[PDB]
């Protein structure tokens, strides 16, 4: 998954995912689903988490796969979500979810770490807490 493709991605705001990749800084992806309530409710927490200084250090964004994983189709989803959360939350939509399929995820929620180079560094399956994020930004080796 070249960084040219990942950066090529686009958000629900028809914005370039590249804007969320640069400064040789780390990037964190979070997969969610509309049919997923816990996720929807997490958005709010993820939106503020993206505003957390601790998190600021790294890039925080979400990824969604339209028509993938029984998830709303493209266009219909962005429109649905367009009426959810605020215009201050990072949302990335990958048709078919090349990254989700590349990592053979197809499971949400999910977290993905992308080295400062823009390559897959570490993949996480499940959910994490604000604290975990800290430990993540502190060290990936961190594990109970």
JSON list of C-alpha atoms in Angstrom, two decimals:
[
{"chain": "A", "resi": 1, "resn": "UNK", "atom": "CA", "xyz": [0.00, 0.00, 0.00]},
{"chain": "A", "resi": 2, "resn": "UNK", "atom": "CA", "xyz": [2.12, 2.84, -1.34]},
{"chain": "A", "resi": 3, "resn": "UNK", "atom": "CA", "xyz": [1.78, 6.19, 0.43]},
{"chain": "A", "resi": 4, "resn": "UNK", "atom": "CA", "xyz": [0.76, 7.69, -2.89]},
{"chain": "A", "resi": 5, "resn": "UNK", "atom": "CA", "xyz": [-2.39, 5.60, -2.90]},
{"chain": "A", "resi": 6, "resn": "UNK", "atom": "CA", "xyz": [-3.22, 6.10, 0.76]},
{"chain": "A", "resi": 7, "resn": "UNK", "atom": "CA", "xyz": [-2.72, 9.83, 0.36]},
{"chain": "A", "resi": 8, "resn": "UNK", "atom": "CA", "xyz": [-4.75, 9.63, -2.83]},
{"chain": "A", "resi": 9, "resn": "UNK", "atom": "CA", "xyz": [-7.74, 8.47, -0.82]},
{"chain": "A", "resi": 10, "resn": "UNK", "atom": "CA", "xyz": [-10.52, 10.97, -0.24]},
{"chain": "A", "resi": 11, "resn": "UNK", "atom": "CA", "xyz": [-12.65, 11.82, 2.77]},
{"chain": "A", "resi": 12, "resn": "UNK", "atom": "CA", "xyz": [-16.39, 12.32, 3.05]},
{"chain": "A", "resi": 13, "resn": "UNK", "atom": "CA", "xyz": [-15.52, 15.97, 2.56]},
{"chain": "A", "resi": 14, "resn": "UNK", "atom": "CA", "xyz": [-14.18, 15.19, -0.90]},
{"chain": "A", "resi": 15, "resn": "UNK", "atom": "CA", "xyz": [-10.85, 16.14, 0.63]},
{"chain": "A", "resi": 16, "resn": "UNK", "atom": "CA", "xyz": [-7.45, 14.55, -0.07]},
{"chain": "A", "resi": 17, "resn": "UNK", "atom": "CA", "xyz": [-6.33, 12.09, 2.58]},
{"chain": "A", "resi": 18, "resn": "UNK", "atom": "CA", "xyz": [-2.89, 13.50, 1.87]},
{"chain": "A", "resi": 19, "resn": "UNK", "atom": "CA", "xyz": [-3.74, 16.55, 3.94]},
{"chain": "A", "resi": 20, "resn": "UNK", "atom": "CA", "xyz": [-3.82, 14.03, 6.76]},
{"chain": "A", "resi": 21, "resn": "UNK", "atom": "CA", "xyz": [-0.39, 12.68, 5.88]},
{"chain": "A", "resi": 22, "resn": "UNK", "atom": "CA", "xyz": [2.85, 14.63, 6.01]},
{"chain": "A", "resi": 23, "resn": "UNK", "atom": "CA", "xyz": [5.41, 16.20, 8.32]},
{"chain": "A", "resi": 24, "resn": "UNK", "atom": "CA", "xyz": [7.01, 12.78, 8.50]},
{"chain": "A", "resi": 25, "resn": "UNK", "atom": "CA", "xyz": [4.55, 12.22, 11.32]},
{"chain": "A", "resi": 26, "resn": "UNK", "atom": "CA", "xyz": [2.78, 9.00, 12.34]},
{"chain": "A", "resi": 27, "resn": "UNK", "atom": "CA", "xyz": [-0.75, 8.24, 11.19]},
{"chain": "A", "resi": 28, "resn": "UNK", "atom": "CA", "xyz": [-3.50, 6.24, 12.85]},
{"chain": "A", "resi": 29, "resn": "UNK", "atom": "CA", "xyz": [-6.53, 4.84, 11.07]},
{"chain": "A", "resi": 30, "resn": "UNK", "atom": "CA", "xyz": [-9.78, 3.71, 12.65]},
{"chain": "A", "resi": 31, "resn": "UNK", "atom": "CA", "xyz": [-12.35, 1.64, 10.79]},
{"chain": "A", "resi": 32, "resn": "UNK", "atom": "CA", "xyz": [-16.01, 2.06, 11.67]},
{"chain": "A", "resi": 33, "resn": "UNK", "atom": "CA", "xyz": [-19.40, 1.13, 10.26]},
{"chain": "A", "resi": 34, "resn": "UNK", "atom": "CA", "xyz": [-22.70, 2.96, 10.00]},
{"chain": "A", "resi": 35, "resn": "UNK", "atom": "CA", "xyz": [-24.60, -0.18, 10.92]},
{"chain": "A", "resi": 36, "resn": "UNK", "atom": "CA", "xyz": [-22.33, -0.11, 13.95]},
{"chain": "A", "resi": 37, "resn": "UNK", "atom": "CA", "xyz": [-23.89, 1.93, 16.77]},
{"chain": "A", "resi": 38, "resn": "UNK", "atom": "CA", "xyz": [-21.03, 1.60, 19.22]},
{"chain": "A", "resi": 39, "resn": "UNK", "atom": "CA", "xyz": [-18.92, 3.03, 16.43]},
{"chain": "A", "resi": 40, "resn": "UNK", "atom": "CA", "xyz": [-21.33, 5.86, 15.72]},
{"chain": "A", "resi": 41, "resn": "UNK", "atom": "CA", "xyz": [-21.26, 6.70, 19.41]},
{"chain": "A", "resi": 42, "resn": "UNK", "atom": "CA", "xyz": [-17.49, 6.36, 19.24]},
{"chain": "A", "resi": 43, "resn": "UNK", "atom": "CA", "xyz": [-17.34, 8.97, 16.50]},
{"chain": "A", "resi": 44, "resn": "UNK", "atom": "CA", "xyz": [-18.03, 11.68, 19.04]},
{"chain": "A", "resi": 45, "resn": "UNK", "atom": "CA", "xyz": [-15.27, 10.29, 21.23]},
{"chain": "A", "resi": 46, "resn": "UNK", "atom": "CA", "xyz": [-13.06, 9.85, 18.18]},
{"chain": "A", "resi": 47, "resn": "UNK", "atom": "CA", "xyz": [-13.79, 13.40, 17.07]},
{"chain": "A", "resi": 48, "resn": "UNK", "atom": "CA", "xyz": [-12.68, 14.83, 20.39]},
{"chain": "A", "resi": 49, "resn": "UNK", "atom": "CA", "xyz": [-9.84, 12.33, 20.60]},
{"chain": "A", "resi": 50, "resn": "UNK", "atom": "CA", "xyz": [-8.64, 13.83, 17.34]},
{"chain": "A", "resi": 51, "resn": "UNK", "atom": "CA", "xyz": [-8.61, 17.14, 19.17]},
{"chain": "A", "resi": 52, "resn": "UNK", "atom": "CA", "xyz": [-6.56, 15.78, 22.05]},
{"chain": "A", "resi": 53, "resn": "UNK", "atom": "CA", "xyz": [-3.05, 17.18, 22.19]},
{"chain": "A", "resi": 54, "resn": "UNK", "atom": "CA", "xyz": [-1.75, 13.73, 23.06]},
{"chain": "A", "resi": 55, "resn": "UNK", "atom": "CA", "xyz": [-3.41, 12.51, 19.89]},
{"chain": "A", "resi": 56, "resn": "UNK", "atom": "CA", "xyz": [-2.52, 15.64, 17.95]},
{"chain": "A", "resi": 57, "resn": "UNK", "atom": "CA", "xyz": [1.08, 14.46, 18.04]},
{"chain": "A", "resi": 58, "resn": "UNK", "atom": "CA", "xyz": [-0.02, 11.82, 15.55]},
{"chain": "A", "resi": 59, "resn": "UNK", "atom": "CA", "xyz": [-2.56, 11.91, 12.75]},
{"chain": "A", "resi": 60, "resn": "UNK", "atom": "CA", "xyz": [-5.93, 10.44, 13.63]},
{"chain": "A", "resi": 61, "resn": "UNK", "atom": "CA", "xyz": [-8.45, 9.54, 10.95]},
{"chain": "A", "resi": 62, "resn": "UNK", "atom": "CA", "xyz": [-11.17, 7.00, 10.27]},
{"chain": "A", "resi": 63, "resn": "UNK", "atom": "CA", "xyz": [-11.72, 4.70, 7.32]},
{"chain": "A", "resi": 64, "resn": "UNK", "atom": "CA", "xyz": [-14.96, 3.35, 5.89]},
{"chain": "A", "resi": 65, "resn": "UNK", "atom": "CA", "xyz": [-15.64, 0.78, 3.20]},
{"chain": "A", "resi": 66, "resn": "UNK", "atom": "CA", "xyz": [-18.73, 1.48, 1.09]},
{"chain": "A", "resi": 67, "resn": "UNK", "atom": "CA", "xyz": [-20.60, -1.56, -0.17]},
{"chain": "A", "resi": 68, "resn": "UNK", "atom": "CA", "xyz": [-18.05, -3.54, 1.81]},
{"chain": "A", "resi": 69, "resn": "UNK", "atom": "CA", "xyz": [-18.87, -5.50, 4.95]},
{"chain": "A", "resi": 70, "resn": "UNK", "atom": "CA", "xyz": [-22.57, -4.90, 4.40]},
{"chain": "A", "resi": 71, "resn": "UNK", "atom": "CA", "xyz": [-21.68, -1.26, 4.94]},
{"chain": "A", "resi": 72, "resn": "UNK", "atom": "CA", "xyz": [-23.70, 1.44, 3.22]},
{"chain": "A", "resi": 73, "resn": "UNK", "atom": "CA", "xyz": [-22.69, 2.06, -0.37]},
{"chain": "A", "resi": 74, "resn": "UNK", "atom": "CA", "xyz": [-20.58, 5.01, -1.46]},
{"chain": "A", "resi": 75, "resn": "UNK", "atom": "CA", "xyz": [-22.39, 8.32, -1.84]},
{"chain": "A", "resi": 76, "resn": "UNK", "atom": "CA", "xyz": [-25.30, 7.07, 0.23]},
{"chain": "A", "resi": 77, "resn": "UNK", "atom": "CA", "xyz": [-23.01, 6.70, 3.22]},
{"chain": "A", "resi": 78, "resn": "UNK", "atom": "CA", "xyz": [-21.18, 10.00, 3.00]},
{"chain": "A", "resi": 79, "resn": "UNK", "atom": "CA", "xyz": [-24.60, 11.60, 2.73]},
{"chain": "A", "resi": 80, "resn": "UNK", "atom": "CA", "xyz": [-25.84, 9.67, 5.74]},
{"chain": "A", "resi": 81, "resn": "UNK", "atom": "CA", "xyz": [-22.78, 10.53, 7.79]},
{"chain": "A", "resi": 82, "resn": "UNK", "atom": "CA", "xyz": [-22.87, 14.01, 6.29]},
{"chain": "A", "resi": 83, "resn": "UNK", "atom": "CA", "xyz": [-25.78, 14.48, 8.66]},
{"chain": "A", "resi": 84, "resn": "UNK", "atom": "CA", "xyz": [-23.87, 13.04, 11.59]},
{"chain": "A", "resi": 85, "resn": "UNK", "atom": "CA", "xyz": [-21.05, 14.24, 13.81]},
{"chain": "A", "resi": 86, "resn": "UNK", "atom": "CA", "xyz": [-19.47, 17.60, 13.10]},
{"chain": "A", "resi": 87, "resn": "UNK", "atom": "CA", "xyz": [-17.29, 18.93, 10.26]},
{"chain": "A", "resi": 88, "resn": "UNK", "atom": "CA", "xyz": [-14.28, 18.46, 12.51]},
{"chain": "A", "resi": 89, "resn": "UNK", "atom": "CA", "xyz": [-13.99, 14.69, 12.40]},
{"chain": "A", "resi": 90, "resn": "UNK", "atom": "CA", "xyz": [-11.67, 12.88, 9.97]},
{"chain": "A", "resi": 91, "resn": "UNK", "atom": "CA", "xyz": [-13.50, 10.42, 7.75]},
{"chain": "A", "resi": 92, "resn": "UNK", "atom": "CA", "xyz": [-11.93, 8.44, 4.94]},
{"chain": "A", "resi": 93, "resn": "UNK", "atom": "CA", "xyz": [-13.90, 6.37, 2.45]},
{"chain": "A", "resi": 94, "resn": "UNK", "atom": "CA", "xyz": [-12.17, 3.67, 0.44]},
{"chain": "A", "resi": 95, "resn": "UNK", "atom": "CA", "xyz": [-14.29, 2.03, -2.23]},
{"chain": "A", "resi": 96, "resn": "UNK", "atom": "CA", "xyz": [-13.96, -1.68, -1.52]},
{"chain": "A", "resi": 97, "resn": "UNK", "atom": "CA", "xyz": [-11.52, -0.84, 1.25]},
{"chain": "A", "resi": 98, "resn": "UNK", "atom": "CA", "xyz": [-8.21, -1.68, -0.40]},
{"chain": "A", "resi": 99, "resn": "UNK", "atom": "CA", "xyz": [-6.47, -1.06, 2.91]},
{"chain": "A", "resi": 100, "resn": "UNK", "atom": "CA", "xyz": [-9.11, -3.02, 4.78]},
{"chain": "A", "resi": 101, "resn": "UNK", "atom": "CA", "xyz": [-8.89, -5.81, 2.23]},
{"chain": "A", "resi": 102, "resn": "UNK", "atom": "CA", "xyz": [-5.12, -5.53, 1.95]},
{"chain": "A", "resi": 103, "resn": "UNK", "atom": "CA", "xyz": [-4.81, -6.07, 5.68]},
{"chain": "A", "resi": 104, "resn": "UNK", "atom": "CA", "xyz": [-7.59, -8.63, 5.43]},
{"chain": "A", "resi": 105, "resn": "UNK", "atom": "CA", "xyz": [-9.52, -6.81, 8.13]},
{"chain": "A", "resi": 106, "resn": "UNK", "atom": "CA", "xyz": [-13.17, -6.81, 7.13]},
{"chain": "A", "resi": 107, "resn": "UNK", "atom": "CA", "xyz": [-13.88, -6.34, 10.82]},
{"chain": "A", "resi": 108, "resn": "UNK", "atom": "CA", "xyz": [-14.85, -3.26, 12.79]},
{"chain": "A", "resi": 109, "resn": "UNK", "atom": "CA", "xyz": [-14.05, -1.45, 14.71]},
{"chain": "A", "resi": 110, "resn": "UNK", "atom": "CA", "xyz": [-10.35, -1.62, 13.90]},
{"chain": "A", "resi": 111, "resn": "UNK", "atom": "CA", "xyz": [-7.23, 0.48, 14.33]},
{"chain": "A", "resi": 112, "resn": "UNK", "atom": "CA", "xyz": [-4.26, 0.66, 11.99]},
{"chain": "A", "resi": 113, "resn": "UNK", "atom": "CA", "xyz": [-0.87, 2.27, 12.50]},
{"chain": "A", "resi": 114, "resn": "UNK", "atom": "CA", "xyz": [1.06, 3.78, 9.62]},
{"chain": "A", "resi": 115, "resn": "UNK", "atom": "CA", "xyz": [4.75, 4.48, 10.11]},
{"chain": "A", "resi": 116, "resn": "UNK", "atom": "CA", "xyz": [6.00, 8.03, 9.71]},
{"chain": "A", "resi": 117, "resn": "UNK", "atom": "CA", "xyz": [6.99, 6.87, 6.25]},
{"chain": "A", "resi": 118, "resn": "UNK", "atom": "CA", "xyz": [3.36, 6.19, 5.39]},
{"chain": "A", "resi": 119, "resn": "UNK", "atom": "CA", "xyz": [3.52, 2.41, 5.49]},
{"chain": "A", "resi": 120, "resn": "UNK", "atom": "CA", "xyz": [1.75, -0.22, 7.55]},
{"chain": "A", "resi": 121, "resn": "UNK", "atom": "CA", "xyz": [3.50, -0.25, 10.91]},
{"chain": "A", "resi": 122, "resn": "UNK", "atom": "CA", "xyz": [1.12, -2.07, 13.22]},
{"chain": "A", "resi": 123, "resn": "UNK", "atom": "CA", "xyz": [-2.42, -3.38, 12.94]},
{"chain": "A", "resi": 124, "resn": "UNK", "atom": "CA", "xyz": [-4.87, -3.55, 15.82]},
{"chain": "A", "resi": 125, "resn": "UNK", "atom": "CA", "xyz": [-8.06, -5.58, 15.94]},
{"chain": "A", "resi": 126, "resn": "UNK", "atom": "CA", "xyz": [-10.86, -4.38, 18.19]},
{"chain": "A", "resi": 127, "resn": "UNK", "atom": "CA", "xyz": [-11.20, -1.16, 20.16]},
{"chain": "A", "resi": 128, "resn": "UNK", "atom": "CA", "xyz": [-8.92, 0.87, 22.40]},
{"chain": "A", "resi": 129, "resn": "UNK", "atom": "CA", "xyz": [-9.24, 3.51, 25.09]},
{"chain": "A", "resi": 130, "resn": "UNK", "atom": "CA", "xyz": [-7.83, 7.01, 25.32]},
{"chain": "A", "resi": 131, "resn": "UNK", "atom": "CA", "xyz": [-5.19, 5.64, 27.66]},
{"chain": "A", "resi": 132, "resn": "UNK", "atom": "CA", "xyz": [-4.17, 2.97, 25.18]},
{"chain": "A", "resi": 133, "resn": "UNK", "atom": "CA", "xyz": [-3.69, 5.68, 22.58]},
{"chain": "A", "resi": 134, "resn": "UNK", "atom": "CA", "xyz": [-1.22, 7.34, 24.92]},
{"chain": "A", "resi": 135, "resn": "UNK", "atom": "CA", "xyz": [0.67, 4.09, 25.34]},
{"chain": "A", "resi": 136, "resn": "UNK", "atom": "CA", "xyz": [0.50, 3.79, 21.57]},
{"chain": "A", "resi": 137, "resn": "UNK", "atom": "CA", "xyz": [2.00, 7.22, 21.02]},
{"chain": "A", "resi": 138, "resn": "UNK", "atom": "CA", "xyz": [4.42, 6.39, 23.80]},
{"chain": "A", "resi": 139, "resn": "UNK", "atom": "CA", "xyz": [5.47, 3.00, 22.49]},
{"chain": "A", "resi": 140, "resn": "UNK", "atom": "CA", "xyz": [3.96, 0.33, 20.24]},
{"chain": "A", "resi": 141, "resn": "UNK", "atom": "CA", "xyz": [5.62, -2.33, 22.35]},
{"chain": "A", "resi": 142, "resn": "UNK", "atom": "CA", "xyz": [3.22, -1.33, 25.09]},
{"chain": "A", "resi": 143, "resn": "UNK", "atom": "CA", "xyz": [1.03, -4.36, 25.72]},
{"chain": "A", "resi": 144, "resn": "UNK", "atom": "CA", "xyz": [-0.56, -5.96, 28.76]}
]
